[PDB]
Write a protein that binds this ligand. Structure first.
Ligand code: B12
Ligand SMILES: *[C@@H]1O[C@H](CO)[C@@H](O[C@@H]2O[C@H](CO)[C@@H](O[C@@H]3O[C@H](CO[C@H]4O[C@H](CO)[C@@H](O)[C@H](O)[C@@H]4O)[C@@H](O)[C@H](O[C@H]4O[C@H](CO)[C@@H](O)[C@H](O)[C@@H]4O)[C@@H]3O)[C@H](O)[C@H]2NC(C)=O)[C@H](O)[C@H]1NC(C)=O
Ligand SMILES: *[C@@H]1O[C@H](CO)[C@@H](O[C@@H]2O[C@H](CO)[C@@H](O[C@@H]3O[C@H](CO[C@H]4O[C@H](CO)[C@@H](O)[C@H](O)[C@@H]4O)[C@@H](O)[C@H](O[C@H]4O[C@H](CO)[C@@H](O)[C@H](O)[C@@H]4O)[C@@H]3O)[C@H](O)[C@H]2NC(C)=O)[C@H](O)[C@H]1NC(C)=O
Ligand SMILES: *[C@@H]1O[C@H](CO)[C@@H](O[C@@H]2O[C@H](CO)[C@@H](O)[C@H](O)[C@H]2NC(C)=O)[C@H](O)[C@H]1NC(C)=O
Ligand code: NAG
Ligand code: NAG
Ligand code: NAG
Ligand code: NAG
Ligand code: NAG
Ligand code: NAG
Ligand code: NAG
Ligand code: CA
Ligand code: CA
Ligand code: CA
Ligand code: CA
Lengths: 385, 457
């Protein structure tokens, strides 16, 4: 179809390892990865066994709905019984309701995981929630986010294939309606160059498209996308192990939907061994116009050894030079998030974060991956979704 | 020019559109769509030279499939939607030499006559009910109810039965939209869902417009309600800190020889302010044929801020006090399209000039307070008196040395304090006759309520 050219396969098993290597005892346990390496067939059985044991021991109360869905799913692909996590998520999802049709689109990315993982344990018991979710998702009218469109289509495809024998002609028709509407919204974001939405969102979307019951009018040029993603690995865009975890499945021709079919102990193959600069200035603004009546517009300039210094160095160096640019950080499945600058901290009940943009257009890598250029103007706005 | 349309969907261009149409035209259209079906006309845009008898420039639409005709339309006025009896429609556009405008855009579409529920009522009798009631109403159904009446009165609708699908969060599945005029965009009395009996609804006109929508799944019994056509009154007591209202028939020309009345009062201690997205009435030197009087205060006795007539669009009208009264009167003969009035309630830089006592409440209250306010009230004690305080409710964000959200108090120039939290502040008294209250609020919240407090002299 658009199965990866065997010529290019080495390029794939590349990242597979580069991802598995990220699993250590102090690494943050990343379900998305264990699913990814279980789906793709794990090389590093020590790694896999380690990260499984971590997810097993995880505390249920620290887990958001999405966490919890991911985890149930991740365990499931290690042929480990989640059991209790499923009870919990199930109770949490009866009581589930979104905000408002004007509310942000990604607000549905979390629930998409819950439903998907839940449908996978019990479809019939999941129906009510799946309905409630579709009606709402459809009615929502904020600007389409692809990452979420993609996940929703997995959750919604799974349900669509498991309508209990007898059920009123209606569920399927609703689910499918939403499913089509979503697939249209997606093809509409496929670039004249193989990318769906953007790079880091593309892997999720590939899954989505190769699984929804009704394809888009304008037929999707799969081979193009899969080739584009491949050159783009040669180009080093996929170093962050989470991002690997979100394309590895497509590349291995899989979807989160195949998690229940994972087999255990294939006994995998050893992927053979494959073995000046004048420091720059970056202009770094940090602006608050939202929290209390004590806010900021303070700009600054720093030097960062060569390029290859990532935005986080700018941050750390700004912090060091001037105490007003203090900032605090916090770890996640995707990496280091800047959680607070200047004692203004992101807060969930305000739906309020720190957004990093280049002069005016928002960035799209974390500060620990992003690499600023010789006279770039990075601004950090405290704002909301 | 002129053309005839077969398509199920289409648009209809004024020749000049997007700007402007030619003078002296004799153009004609004809729209025909499959049988057992209907034509629904939308109406993006529509300027024309206006005319009481409607003679100079104008547009009329005959119901081809039938005798009679839907009407002739000049000016800005023309119902956002029209819908045929048959599957065919006459559409003649006819103008004259002097005066023109951007013309009109105007969409249309086919509509099955089975799936087509739309029903008009007049008899002063509530025979009105959700589809199929008491049996379960259908899915994917839509259904409209206009009800017009005697030009004196108001409509007052009561509900007997009402069980509709529940709401997902702030999302509606299945609802009943109630509007204040006789058109799909008239002010919103409310949208209603779930299983509770709506309050008694009361109009400000003799027209009411209703819509009941249902989605893909889930069905119930629906509703049944009745209505009183009695009072000869029109207008009302307008109680929200902000809202919108309508000269009767709007966007259609209004009724004659009527005197309509509206009293704005909601949040204690904060002045209202007016504005119009649209004004039109009989032009008059000195003004007095058909006019609109605003009044700084609860009744006509109060100081008249303005009297308005003609075709020009007013400057916003900041009342200086708590209440604001508004009366409008029309003489028999001549009628303009009317007005539409956004009105907000302010709090920046108000002054209670004289009042024995009163209340101060943060605009929404008890609704949680709006983000981003620089609020400044000032109560003035006549002569050489003072002002006692007492608080009644308090609920602001918390600490950071009250630097997030807060409220300050002043004795003339001197500050008596800066407050927040859910702690109720002390009684007190000014040694002055000036008493300033400042409430500064920022851009986020768990939706803390605000505050409320008493005052003396
Ligand atoms: C919603 C969302 C956010 C929200 C998260 C809402 C919330 N607090 O729950 C906020 C928090 C609004 C956000 C922030 C950013 N994110 Co974002 N986020 C998403 C999105 C669409 C949903 C992820 C999610 O809900 N996970 C579901 C749960 C189950 O998993 P989780 O482990 O709990 O997920 C957490 C992390 O994903 C984290 N998060 C969200 N975005 C980002 C970005 C970075 C760099 C990091 C480290 C973490 C992070 O928040 C989630 C809760 O903690 C994804 C898309 C995707 N495919 O992942 C991106 C996405 C991962 N984030 C992305 C980006 C670019 C950003 C921003 C850097 C954009 C910007 N200009 O600032 C900022 C980071 C600013 C900072 N100070 O660090 C990119 C990837 C980044 C990369 N390095 O490749 C993604 C992939 C979207 C995309 N396709 O471009 N975004
Ligand atoms: C850095 O951070 C700050 C905070 O995040 C941003 O500030 C806000 O920017 C947005 C504009 O993007 C503003 O919100 C919008 O206001 C528009 C016009 O002004 C409104 O306010 C007046 C009266 O005060 C009204 O009468 C008027 O009609 C408006 O409502 C509106 O058109 C917008 O409505 C639309 O947007 C929303 C979603 O945000 C939709 O869902 C709506 O349905 C609709 O289409 C909106 O209300 C806001 O006023 C700004 N205020 C402040 C101080 O925070 C910066 O933009 C940001 N900078 C960058 C580049 O990062
Ligand atoms: C639309 O809206 C109205 C409510 O606002 C509802 O109409 C009522 O329906 C209920 C129940 O369906 C009726 O209550 C019943 O009254 C019976 C007696 O019949 C007559 O006698 C009484 C008393 O003099 C009158 O009030 C009544 O109207 C009749 O003329 C009683 O025998 C019943 O009460 C018993 O029911 C329960 C258990 O179910 C017990 O616990 C009671 O104590 C008792 O034993 C019966 O409940 C009521 O009469 C109706 N009201 C009206 C129309 O006036 C409709 O239900 C609703 N739906 C529809 C589709 O119309
Ligand atoms: C509250 O708002 C009023 C304006 O309505 C301010 O009152 C005084 O206004 C005069 C001019 O009208 C200025 O010269 C002074 O600055 C004000 N006097 C005092 C004693 O402050 C008042 O300042 C406002 N309070 C605020 C915003 O702090
Ligand atoms: C770049 O140069 C500055 C001084 O110009 C130096 O302090 C800094 O070490 C360099 N960047 C970093 C911290 O790697
Ligand atoms: C407008 O003038 C009068 C209204 O009373 C009516 O007789 C006349 O027919 C109208 N216009 C036309 C078609 O001449
Ligand atoms: C509005 O309030 C006045 C003053 O109490 C009252 O007399 C009048 O009846 C009310 N009008 C309406 C709409 O009932
Ligand atoms: C308040 O009293 C009357 C209104 O009844 C008003 O005319 C007067 O000017 C005001 N008094 C003061 C102190 O300004
Ligand atoms: C106002 O309150 C103070 C509280 O100290 C009290 O002394 C005074 O008698 C009060 N004056 C009035 C208006 O009764
Ligand atoms: C109040 O502001 C902040 C609260 O954290 C603090 O840093 C500051 O020093 C405080 N000011 C005072 C109370 O002197
Ligand atoms: C209003 O009446 C006429 C307007 O044409 C004008 O002559 C007069 O001076 C005005 N004032 C009065 C007397 O009401
Ligand atoms: Ca003319
Ligand atoms: Ca329904
Ligand atoms: Ca008149
Ligand atoms: Ca606030």
């Amino acid at each position: 179809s658009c199965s990866v050219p065997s010529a290019q396969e080495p390029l794939v098993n590349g990242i597979q390892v580069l991802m598995e290597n990220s699993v250590t005892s102090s690494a943050y346990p990343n379900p998305s990865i264990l699913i990814a390496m279980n789906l793709a067939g794990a090389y590093n059985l020590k790694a896999q066994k380690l990260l499984t044991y971590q997810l097993m021991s995880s505390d249920n109360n620290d887990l958001t709905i999405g966490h919890l869905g991911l985890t149930i799913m991740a365990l499931t692909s290690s042929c480990r019984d989640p059991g209790d996590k499923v009870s919990i998520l199930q109770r949490q999802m009866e009581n589930w309701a979104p905000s408002s049709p004007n509310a942000e689109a990604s607000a549905f990315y979390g629930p998409s995981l819950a439903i998907l993982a839940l449908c996978q344990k019990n479809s019939e018991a999941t129906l009510p929630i799946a309905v409630r979710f579709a009606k709402t998702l459809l009615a929502n009218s904020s600007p389409f986010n692809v990452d979420t469109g993609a996940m929703a289509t997995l959750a919604l495809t799974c349900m669509y294939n498991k309508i209990p024998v007898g059920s009123e002609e209606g569920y399927r028709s609703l689910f499918g309606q939403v499913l089509k509407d979503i697939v249209e919204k997606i093809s509409m974001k496929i670039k004249d160059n193989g990318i769906i939405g953007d790079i880091y969102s593309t892997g999720l979307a590939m899954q989505a498209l190769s699984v929804t019951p009704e394809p888009s009018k304008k037929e999707w040029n799969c081979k193009k996308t899969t080739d584009m993603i491949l050159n783009e690995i040669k180009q080093g865009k996929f170093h962050n192990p989470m991002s690997i975890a979100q394309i590895l499945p497509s590349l291995k021709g899989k979807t989160y939907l195949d998690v229940p079919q994972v087999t255990c102990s294939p006994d995998h193959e050893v992927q053979p061994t494959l073995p000046s600069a004048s420091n720059i200035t970056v202009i770094y603004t940090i602006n608050n116009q939202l929290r209390g009546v004590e806010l900021l517009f303070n700009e600054t300039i720093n030097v960062s050894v060569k390029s290859g210094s990532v935005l986080l160095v700018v941050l750390e160096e700004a912090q060091r030079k001037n105490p007003m640019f203090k900032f605090e950080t916090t770890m996640t499945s995707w990496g280091l998030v800047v959680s607070s600058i200047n004692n203004i901290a992101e807060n969930v009940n305000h739906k309020t974060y720190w957004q990093f943009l280049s002069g005016v257009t928002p960035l799209n890598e974390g500060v620990a991956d992003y690499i600023p250029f010789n006279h770039e103007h990075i601004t950090a706005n405290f704002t909301q979704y | 020019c002129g053309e005839i349309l077969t398509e199920s969907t289409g648009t209809i261009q004024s020749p000049g559109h997007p700007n402007v149409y030619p003078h002296g035209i004799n153009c004609t259209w004809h729209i025909l769509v499959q049988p057992n079906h209907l034509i629904h006309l939308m109406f993006e845009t529509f300027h024309l030279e206006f005319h009481y008898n409607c003679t100079n420039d104008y547009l009329e639409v005959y119901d081809t499939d039938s005798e009679t005709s839907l009407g002739r339309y000049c000016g800005k006025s023309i119902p956002p939607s029209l819908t045929s009896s048959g599957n065919s429609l006459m559409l003649v556009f006819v103008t004259d030499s002097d005066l023109a405008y951007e013309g009109f855009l105007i969409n249309y579409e086919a509509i099955s006559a089975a799936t087509a529920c739309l029903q008009d009522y007049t008899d002063d009798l509530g025979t009105f009910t959700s589809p199929n009631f008491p049996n379960n109403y259908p899915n994917n159904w839509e259904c409209i109810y206009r009800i017009t009446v005697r030009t004196g009165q108001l409509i007052a609708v009561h509900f007997t039965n009402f069980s509709l699908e529940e709401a997902i969060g702030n999302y509606y599945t299945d609802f009943l939209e109630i509007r204040d005029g006789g058109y799909e965009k008239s002010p919103l009395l409310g949208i209603f869902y779930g299983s509770n009996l709506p309050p008694t609804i009361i109009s400000h006109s003799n027209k009411l417009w209703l819509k009941f929508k249902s989605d893909q799944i889930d069905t119930r019994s629906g509703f049944s309600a009745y209505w009183d056509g009695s009072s000869t009154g029109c207008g009302g007591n307008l109680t929200t800190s902000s809202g919108t209202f309508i000269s009767p028939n709007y966007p259609m020309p209004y009724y004659h020889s009527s005197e309509c009345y509206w009293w704005l009062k909601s949040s204690h201690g904060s002045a209202f302010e007016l504005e119009f997205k649209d004004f039109h009435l009989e032009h008059h030197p000195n003004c007095t044929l058909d006019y609109l009087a605003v009044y700084d205060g609860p009744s006509s006795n109060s100081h008249l801020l303005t009297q308005l007539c003609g075709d020009e669009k007013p400057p916003l009208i900041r009342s200086s006090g708590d209440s604001m009264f508004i009366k409008l009167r029309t003489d028999e003969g001549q009628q303009g399209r009317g007005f539409k009035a956004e009105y907000r309630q302010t709090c920046e830089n108000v002054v209670i000039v004289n009042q024995t006592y009163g209340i101060l409440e943060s605009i929404g209250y008890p609704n949680p307070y709006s983000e981003n306010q620089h609020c400044n009230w000032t109560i003035r004690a006549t002569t050489g008196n003072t002002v006692n305080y007492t608080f009644l409710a308090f609920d602001l964000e918390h600490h950071i040395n009250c630097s997030t959200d807060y409220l300050e108090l002043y004795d003339g120039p001197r500050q008596m304090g800066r407050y927040c939290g859910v702690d109720l502040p002390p009684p007190g008294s000014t040694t002055s006759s000036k008493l300033q209250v400042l409430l500064l609020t920022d851009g986020v919240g768990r939706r803390e309520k605000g505050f409320q407090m008493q005052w003396f002299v």
